[PDB]
Design a binder for these strands. Structure first.
Ligand SMILES: [Mg+2]
Ligand SMILES: [Mg+2]
Ligand SMILES: [Mg+2]
Ligand SMILES: [Mg+2]
Ligand SMILES: [Mg+2]
Ligand SMILES: [Mg+2]
Ligand SMILES: [Mg+2]
Ligand SMILES: [Mg+2]
Ligand SMILES: [Mg+2]
Ligand SMILES: [Mg+2]
Ligand SMILES: [Mg+2]
Ligand SMILES: [Mg+2]
Ligand SMILES: [Mg+2]
Ligand SMILES: [Mg+2]
Ligand SMILES: [Mg+2]
Ligand SMILES: [Mg+2]
Ligand SMILES: [Mg+2]
Ligand SMILES: [Mg+2]
Ligand SMILES: [Mg+2]
Ligand SMILES: [Mg+2]
Ligand SMILES: [Mg+2]
Ligand SMILES: [Mg+2]
Ligand SMILES: [Mg+2]
Ligand SMILES: [Mg+2]
Ligand SMILES: [Mg+2]
Ligand SMILES: [Mg+2]
Ligand SMILES: [Mg+2]
Ligand SMILES: [Mg+2]
Ligand SMILES: [Mg+2]
Ligand SMILES: [Mg+2]
Ligand SMILES: [Mg+2]
Ligand SMILES: [Mg+2]
Ligand SMILES: [Mg+2]
Ligand SMILES: [Mg+2]
Ligand SMILES: [Mg+2]
Ligand SMILES: [Mg+2]
Ligand SMILES: [Mg+2]
Ligand SMILES: [Mg+2]
Ligand SMILES: [Mg+2]
Ligand SMILES: [Mg+2]
Ligand SMILES: [Mg+2]
Ligand SMILES: [Mg+2]
Ligand SMILES: [Mg+2]
Ligand SMILES: [Mg+2]
Ligand SMILES: [Mg+2]
Ligand SMILES: [Mg+2]
Ligand SMILES: [Mg+2]
Ligand SMILES: [Mg+2]
Ligand SMILES: [Mg+2]
Ligand SMILES: [Mg+2]
Ligand SMILES: [Mg+2]
Ligand SMILES: [Mg+2]
Ligand SMILES: [Mg+2]
Ligand SMILES: [Mg+2]
Ligand SMILES: [Mg+2]
Ligand SMILES: [Mg+2]
Ligand SMILES: [Mg+2]
Ligand SMILES: [Mg+2]
Ligand SMILES: [Mg+2]
Ligand SMILES: [Mg+2]
Ligand SMILES: [Mg+2]
Ligand SMILES: [Mg+2]
Ligand SMILES: [Mg+2]
Ligand SMILES: [Mg+2]
Ligand SMILES: [Mg+2]
Ligand SMILES: [Mg+2]
Ligand SMILES: [Mg+2]
Ligand SMILES: [Mg+2]
Ligand SMILES: [Mg+2]
Ligand SMILES: [Mg+2]
Ligand SMILES: [Mg+2]
Ligand SMILES: [Mg+2]
Ligand SMILES: [Mg+2]
Ligand SMILES: [Mg+2]
Ligand SMILES: [Mg+2]
Ligand SMILES: [Mg+2]
Ligand SMILES: [Mg+2]
Ligand SMILES: [Mg+2]
Ligand SMILES: [Mg+2]
Ligand SMILES: [Mg+2]
Ligand SMILES: [Mg+2]
Ligand SMILES: [Mg+2]
Ligand SMILES: [Mg+2]
Ligand SMILES: [Mg+2]
Ligand SMILES: [Mg+2]
Ligand SMILES: [Mg+2]
Ligand SMILES: [Mg+2]
Ligand SMILES: [Mg+2]
Ligand SMILES: [Mg+2]
Ligand SMILES: [Mg+2]
Ligand SMILES: [Mg+2]
Ligand SMILES: [Mg+2]
Ligand SMILES: [Mg+2]
Ligand SMILES: [Mg+2]
Ligand SMILES: [Mg+2]
Ligand SMILES: [Mg+2]
Ligand SMILES: [Mg+2]
Ligand SMILES: [Mg+2]
Ligand SMILES: [Mg+2]
Ligand SMILES: [Mg+2]
Ligand SMILES: [Mg+2]
Ligand SMILES: [Mg+2]
Ligand SMILES: [Mg+2]
Ligand SMILES: [Mg+2]
Ligand SMILES: [Mg+2]
Ligand SMILES: [Mg+2]
Ligand SMILES: [Mg+2]
Ligand SMILES: [Mg+2]
Ligand SMILES: [Mg+2]
Ligand SMILES: [Mg+2]
Ligand SMILES: [Mg+2]
Ligand SMILES: [Mg+2]
Ligand SMILES: [Mg+2]
Ligand SMILES: [Mg+2]
Ligand SMILES: [Mg+2]
Ligand SMILES: [Mg+2]
Ligand SMILES: [Mg+2]
Ligand SMILES: [Mg+2]
Ligand SMILES: [Mg+2]
Ligand SMILES: [Mg+2]
Ligand SMILES: [Mg+2]
Ligand SMILES: [Mg+2]
Ligand SMILES: [Mg+2]
Ligand SMILES: [Mg+2]
Ligand SMILES: [Mg+2]
Ligand SMILES: [Mg+2]
Ligand SMILES: [Mg+2]
Ligand SMILES: [Zn+2]
Lengths: 37, 140, 204, 174, 12
RNA sequence: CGCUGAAAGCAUCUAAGCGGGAAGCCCGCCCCAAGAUGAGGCCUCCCACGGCAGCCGGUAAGGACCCGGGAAGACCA
RNA sequence: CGAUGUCGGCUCGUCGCAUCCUGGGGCUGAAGAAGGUCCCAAGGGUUGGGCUGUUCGCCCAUUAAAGCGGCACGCGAGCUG
RNA sequence: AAGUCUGGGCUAAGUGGUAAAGGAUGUGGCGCCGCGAAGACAGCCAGCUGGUCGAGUGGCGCCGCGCCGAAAAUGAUCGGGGCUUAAGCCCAGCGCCGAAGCUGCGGGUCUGGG
């Protein structure tokens, strides 16, 4: 998981979801998984 | 003429079903009743309020996410002795304290203020031991 | 949960499988139940046990009353065991078989006014290199203007010992029912002649 | 573009009783209650159940599709019922039944014995296939995930507990 | 860290 | 980290709901503790005194004083 | 400035967490073992020596680890000097 | 001490009640194009075209209010309790409370006019 102030889509298959008051970015590629913070 | 000051009268007893009422908005009225500020002969330097019996305090109700976010706090005087207790848990363990803390913070500080708090009888569960006083059902 | 009153009698080692095993001998039996605490009456469950026979010349009327309502000889010591309800009217050492692990409570030896070194295992001061009358003193006890006070709980000199102490999970090495002895492996709070409580262990 | 207003076929013959905030779906395989938002109104038509929302704002739209599917899944549950299949891949790895219970031998120093909760039935055809079956779709799915959790698919080898229809994507070893 | 005295050592 | 699942026919651990998950948090262990003036509870004992929620006087059950001591202790306890 | 005693050590702690270890995680150019990197976590723990007044630092031998800070650069009506 | 006052609206963070670049399918309200009953977007059956689904769908910008970014040392807290169609925020009202200011009544002293 990456934890950043700037979470962005990295590849066309990335997906910005919002869960529990937090912006995540989940994806098929494990490297792309992000959490804001 | 000098302002009327009442001699000691028989204090009224009162019953309130806390069930489904919003914690704070009920506490306020209980406090007023405790101060006797509903009585036209109110006097600020003696206890002449009502006695207030509250039932179903375990079913007090509350808005927002306060059930898991509202923190009750206790400092013991010892290093690291700050205890934090959530609403949810207070209800789960000592539910009457929830409403008791609320009213207490809305009564005056000082000796009289402590005496008024004493006339507040609060119970979890529909019943109360004070049928002896036969307290008047109040809708609030 | 089960328990018994008793007095600490002394220490020895016995031999068991080519091993020396340190033991404390305890005289536990026999303890008559003189009251039972019940949820409908007392709100909790326990047994008030009596221990050691007393000269009726020394037992007063409110005390006599209590004993008689239980049909019991005047006893010197009255003490409860919680969540213990023996089928009998009398509790003896036989409720403990060897191999069981037990919890022993007694009154620790009193050191009276104890310095900070004995009490709290402080380091004290140097005995040379300029040390000035501080060889057994406790050092600093605080900070400065912030917080400008001393913590509740600050370890300081003061009375030490003569307090309730429980040591836990002691082995029952043997039991001699004909003499009301219990043999427990290791050390037990307090002096010989000291009253001790023996309960089945709370450890697992 | 819509789930909540798409009607729910009810097979002959399962019954759908409607109470405030819940619906009871009884059928050939058993019964199960579905809690429903007191804001949504579920309707009992002929051979069909429908769900209607009281406005077109966000919260009501969000409950709508949810409520419809909750009931649709309940319906299929008591008629066809649900199941999920688990493939066990890896050499020493195998599974077997012991009474109602399922015993995984999946490479630990011990075997794992999964007890089935109420409404759940275990099956072992081959020693390498397991079927978790029941009328509660969320419950079956749960237990299935549970079984899989015991020994997830390795990332390097085609070894472990797999979902049927789960693709074996692996990364190279040194 | 070594900083300089601001106050002398106390004399009789 | 998931199950079920819309808004968004797909997808989504979440918006309804439900699981898993730390030496950490609550209980559990040990010790203090009803001055907890919110001063609690049980067992047992005394008792229905003479004089004009008060006073004085003798008692009850009980306590203290004094004394012999004490792995209790600075005195006190 | 009609006085707020000043570095270092000792003794005694206590808090923070930007976590040295231990516990729990995600990603890894993660085969295993062992690392990296980020997240959660402050409950406990965080050794003995040589040199220097030293704080610090370097070195020896270990270790799960040999954490960084605040408390008048914590603490001289507590000692040292 | 005086409104749990009235009417319209936003906010779900206890935001209100302590901060920045910057990041975001948070929410509400404007605006602009792209596409589509010559059948679009999604799903399922093929090769950016096809087929049944039968509707809406995708991108850009602006406005309000919120979210993250947000770690520090004794015990916490918006002054406290407590507050969620509000006891928060925006717009518009009526009424009250509130000072040794203003008024009423009485008194003093100086100054000025009688
Ligand atoms: Mg990161
Ligand atoms: Mg970036
Ligand atoms: Mg892109
Ligand atoms: Mg969560
Ligand atoms: Mg995805
Ligand atoms: Mg109310
Ligand atoms: Mg309300
Ligand atoms: Mg009222
Ligand atoms: Mg409510
Ligand atoms: Mg809540
Ligand atoms: Mg503590
Ligand atoms: Mg501690
Ligand atoms: Mg703290
Ligand atoms: Mg503690
Ligand atoms: Mg505490
Ligand atoms: Mg005041
Ligand atoms: Mg033997
Ligand atoms: Mg009981
Ligand atoms: Mg009990
Ligand atoms: Mg029991
Ligand atoms: Mg004892
Ligand atoms: Mg000495
Ligand atoms: Mg000593
Ligand atoms: Mg000691
Ligand atoms: Mg030393
Ligand atoms: Mg020494
Ligand atoms: Mg000297
Ligand atoms: Mg000298
Ligand atoms: Mg000396
Ligand atoms: Mg000082
Ligand atoms: Mg202070
Ligand atoms: Mg003592
Ligand atoms: Mg102890
Ligand atoms: Mg005990
Ligand atoms: Mg052992
Ligand atoms: Mg052992
Ligand atoms: Mg539609
Ligand atoms: Mg799964
Ligand atoms: Mg799947
Ligand atoms: Mg390769
Ligand atoms: Mg001098
Ligand atoms: Mg998944
Ligand atoms: Mg799914
Ligand atoms: Mg679906
Ligand atoms: Mg939810
Ligand atoms: Mg929500
Ligand atoms: Mg959970
Ligand atoms: Mg799981
Ligand atoms: Mg441990
Ligand atoms: Mg005790
Ligand atoms: Mg007591
Ligand atoms: Mg008492
Ligand atoms: Mg007690
Ligand atoms: Mg109190
Ligand atoms: Mg009383
Ligand atoms: Mg008492
Ligand atoms: Mg008794
Ligand atoms: Mg008499
Ligand atoms: Mg008389
Ligand atoms: Mg007498
Ligand atoms: Mg004596
Ligand atoms: Mg002694
Ligand atoms: Mg003596
Ligand atoms: Mg004396
Ligand atoms: Mg000066
Ligand atoms: Mg001076
Ligand atoms: Mg001065
Ligand atoms: Mg040194
Ligand atoms: Mg020293
Ligand atoms: Mg030294
Ligand atoms: Mg030393
Ligand atoms: Mg401190
Ligand atoms: Mg520390
Ligand atoms: Mg420190
Ligand atoms: Mg860092
Ligand atoms: Mg290091
Ligand atoms: Mg680790
Ligand atoms: Mg770690
Ligand atoms: Mg890692
Ligand atoms: Mg590895
Ligand atoms: Mg490698
Ligand atoms: Mg892994
Ligand atoms: Mg390798
Ligand atoms: Mg990095
Ligand atoms: Mg780093
Ligand atoms: Mg870092
Ligand atoms: Mg952290
Ligand atoms: Mg820690
Ligand atoms: Mg701490
Ligand atoms: Mg520390
Ligand atoms: Mg050293
Ligand atoms: Mg040398
Ligand atoms: Mg050295
Ligand atoms: Mg050095
Ligand atoms: Mg350095
Ligand atoms: Mg140097
Ligand atoms: Mg060098
Ligand atoms: Mg290691
Ligand atoms: Mg070192
Ligand atoms: Mg270092
Ligand atoms: Mg340090
Ligand atoms: Mg410092
Ligand atoms: Mg400084
Ligand atoms: Mg200093
Ligand atoms: Mg220092
Ligand atoms: Mg100082
Ligand atoms: Mg000095
Ligand atoms: Mg010094
Ligand atoms: Mg001083
Ligand atoms: Mg000292
Ligand atoms: Mg209103
Ligand atoms: Mg937030
Ligand atoms: Mg707030
Ligand atoms: Mg805030
Ligand atoms: Mg900004
Ligand atoms: Mg963008
Ligand atoms: Mg929007
Ligand atoms: Mg916006
Ligand atoms: Mg299509
Ligand atoms: Mg925040
Ligand atoms: Mg933090
Ligand atoms: Mg702070
Ligand atoms: Mg309004
Ligand atoms: Mg004036
Ligand atoms: Mg005038
Ligand atoms: Mg003048
Ligand atoms: Mg004139
Ligand atoms: Zn991606």
């Amino acid at each position: 998981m990456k934890v950043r102030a700037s979470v962005k889509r990295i590849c066309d298959k990335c997906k910005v979801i919002r869960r529990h008051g937090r912006v995540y970015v989940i994806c098929e590629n494990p490297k792309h998984k992000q959490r804001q913070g | 003429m000098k302002t009327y000051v009442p001699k000691q009268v028989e204090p009224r007893w009162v019953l309130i079903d806390a069930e489904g009422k919003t914690l704070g908005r009920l506490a306020t009225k209980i406090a007023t009743l405790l101060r006797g500020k509903h009585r036209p002969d109110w006097t600020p330097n003696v206890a002449m309020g009502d006695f207030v019996v509250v039932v179903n305090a375990d079913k007090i109700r509350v808005t927002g996410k306060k059930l898991e976010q509202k923190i009750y706090t206790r400092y013991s005087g010892y290093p690291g002795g700050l205890k934090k207790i959530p609403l949810e848990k207070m209800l789960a363990t000592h539910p009457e304290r929830v409403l008791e803390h609320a009213v207490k913070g809305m009564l005056p500080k000082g000796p009289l203020g402590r005496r008024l708090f004493k006339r507040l009888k609060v119970y979890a569960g529909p019943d109360h031991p004070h049928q002896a006083q036969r307290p008047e059902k109040l809708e609030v | 949960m089960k328990g018994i009153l008793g007095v600490k009698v002394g220490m020895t080692r016995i031999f068991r499988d080519d091993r020396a095993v340190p033991v404390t001998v305890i005289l536990a039996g026999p303890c008559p139940v003189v009251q039972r605490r019940t949820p409908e009456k007392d709100g909790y469950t326990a047994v008030q046990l009596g221990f050691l026979p007393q000269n009726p010349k020394r037992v007063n009327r409110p005390l006599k009353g209590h004993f008689a309502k239980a049909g019991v000889e005047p006893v010197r010591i009255l003490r409860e065991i919680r969540d213990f309800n023996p089928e009998g009217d009398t509790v003896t050492v036989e409720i403990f078989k060897p191999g069981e692990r037990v919890d022993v409570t007694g009154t620790s030896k009193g050191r009276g006014f104890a310095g900070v070194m004995k009490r709290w295992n402080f380091a004290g001061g140097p005995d040379s290199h300029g040390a000035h009358k501080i060889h057994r003193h406790p050092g600093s006890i605080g900070n400065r203007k912030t917080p400008g006070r001393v913590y509740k709980g600050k370890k300081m000199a003061g009375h030490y010992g003569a307090e309730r102490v429980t040591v836990m999970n002691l082995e029952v090495v043997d039991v001699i029912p004909e003499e009301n002895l219990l043999l427990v492996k290791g050390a037990v709070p307090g002096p010989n002649g000291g009253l001790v409580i023996v309960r089945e262990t709370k450890k697992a | 573009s819509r789930i909540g207003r798409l009607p729910i076929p009810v097979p002959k013959g399962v019954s759908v009783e409607v109470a405030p905030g819940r619906v009871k779906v009884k059928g050939p395989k058993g019964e199960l209650e579905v809690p429903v938002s007191p804001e949504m109104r579920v309707v009992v038509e002929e051979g069909v159940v429908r769900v209607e929302r009281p406005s077109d704002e966000r919260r009501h739209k969000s409950l709508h599709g949810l409520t419809r599917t909750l009931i649709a899944n309940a319906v299929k549950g008591v008629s066809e019922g649900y199941s999920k299949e688990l493939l066990i891949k890896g050499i020493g790895y195998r599974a077997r039944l012991v009474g109602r219970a399922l015993e995984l031998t999946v490479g630990f120093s011990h075997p794992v014995v999964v007890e089935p909760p109420e409404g759940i039935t275990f099956e072992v055809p081959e020693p390498t296939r397991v079927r978790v079956s029941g009328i509660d779709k969320q419950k079956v799915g749960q237990v299935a995930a549970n079984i899989r959790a015991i020994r997830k698919p390795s990332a390097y080898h085609e070894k472990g507990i797999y979902y049927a229809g789960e693709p074996v994507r692996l990364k190279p070893g040194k | 860290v070594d900083k300089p005295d601001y106050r002398p050592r106390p004399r009789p």
